[PDB]
């Protein structure tokens, strides 16, 4: 109890001359509260179950109708030395590792590379599950982006970025903003539940840090009444995530022309939104306008660094994209 009071220091989060007692829910006005963010976990569980239903009953028949391979991986040829190396040394040999294995086994590099690729495919999930997951991600990202566009088209802060800090902290909470924030937090918690359980043996790096940072930002911005600028970030970031899933779906059906086109479009949208628009527009409204209109708050040192972290992430992935696009030309 006392440690929670220490953590929620009103002189750290809220700006000068502002107390939590000012943001309590009164008769005529409703303000966002931390207690409203507990529904996110139940909604994430409901989303997880709906995802399971969609994958097994809606995506699998479509994959069957599109000649996706319904069987598992292939079987690697038997080899004692290769099996010992795969179980002991590593699972994804590099060029130097392939050369060393060829020297040790006195075998061609192509055969060892094919054997290790087959073993990796055995360890990797089948194409059917990846296709179903990509279809679910595409549908959810398209819904979220469309709802965000419909919500933002009427708001006064999309055109002028100095309207997110208009009457701070006295900005009432609307149904649309609450629904958008709860839906986003629920989706991120659903991704969490899916990753710590179903995929605890797949990936736990850049996308787990990305998820954690996104949940951190969404929660602490919602508690701090700094949510008008968060909708612009959520809608900007979800613009490009609806094309990568379509490109993956085109890839998994062995369509390379559509996959190449959709990936050139995803690359263009990703670069334009997350390298040209995001820093100049959102970090402008965040680093300088927020501190000018709202005043000196210390939470700014936490929030901008995190957004800069996100920007670093979204610059690494863009190098990864610029080379694939070079391969796609």
């Amino acid at each position, epitope marked *: 109890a006392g440690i929670l009071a220490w953590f929620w220091n009103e002189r750290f989060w809220l700006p000068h001359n502002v107390t939590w007692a000012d943001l309590k829910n009164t008769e005529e006005a409703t303000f966002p509260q931390a207690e409203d963010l507990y529904l996110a976990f139940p909604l994430a569980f409901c989303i997880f179950m709906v995802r399971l239903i969609f994958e097994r009953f809606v995506a699998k028949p479509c994959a069957i109708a599109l000649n996706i391979q319904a069987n598992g991986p292939q079987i690697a040829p038997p080899n004692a030395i290769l099996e010992k190396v795969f179980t002991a040394i590593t699972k994804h040999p590099d060029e130097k590792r392939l050369e060393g294995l060829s020297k040790q086994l006195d075998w061609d590099v192509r055969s060892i590379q094919r054997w290790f690729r087959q073993r990796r495919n055995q360890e990797k999930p089948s194409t059917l599950t990846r296709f179903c997951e990509s279809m679910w991600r595409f549908s959810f990202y398209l819904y979220v982006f469309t709802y965000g566009v419909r919500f933002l088209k009427k708001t006064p802060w999309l055109w002028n970025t100095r309207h997110c800090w208009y*009457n701070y902290p006295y900005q009432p909470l609307t149904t649309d903003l609450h629904y958008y924030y709860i839906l986003e937090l629920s989706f991120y918690w659903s991704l969490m539940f899916s990753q710590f359980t179903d995929i605890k043996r797949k990936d736990f790096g850049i996308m787990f840090l990305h998820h954690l940072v996104s949940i951190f930002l969404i929660t602490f911005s919602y508690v701090n009444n700094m949510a008008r600028v968060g909708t612009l970030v959520l809608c900007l970031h979800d613009s490009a995530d609806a094309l990568l899933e379509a490109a993956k779906m085109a890839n998994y059906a062995k369509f390379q022309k559509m996959c190449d086109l959709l990936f050139v479009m995803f690359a263009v949208v990703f670069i334009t939104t997350r390298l040209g628009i995001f820093p100049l527009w959102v970090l402008n409204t965040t680093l300088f306008e927020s501190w000018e209109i709202v005043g000196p708050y210390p939470s700014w040192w936490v929030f901008n660094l995190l957004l800069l972290l996100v920007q670093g992430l979204n610059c690494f992935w863009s190098y990864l994209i610029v080379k694939i696009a070079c391969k796609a030309v």
Partner: nanobody
Amino acid sequence: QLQFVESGGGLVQAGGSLRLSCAASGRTFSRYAVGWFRQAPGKEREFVASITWNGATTYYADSVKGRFTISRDNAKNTVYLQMNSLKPEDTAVYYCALDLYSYGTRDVADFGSWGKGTRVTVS
């Protein structure tokens, strides 16, 4: 409903200076942003000026800048619009309004809890 009552109006000679007051019978007038709107005869309501809860931002109309000033006193719960160098355009009925979702726009449909309205006459 914090129904406003605009007072402070009469007839002023041209090139004059007149102060107007809007009084709110409520306890939560200090959290809201308020605005002053005018309704020209045989015309629709226009946006004259607006002010936030703590006087941080004062938005004006492109026709009243400099000439018109808006201020508010939280303890008294009153808003004071000082008009200066009054031209004949100012002749209308002024209504004091309240902003409902802190949107910062220039619109008649975002402002509720309107008032009966005070009248100004400019020669």
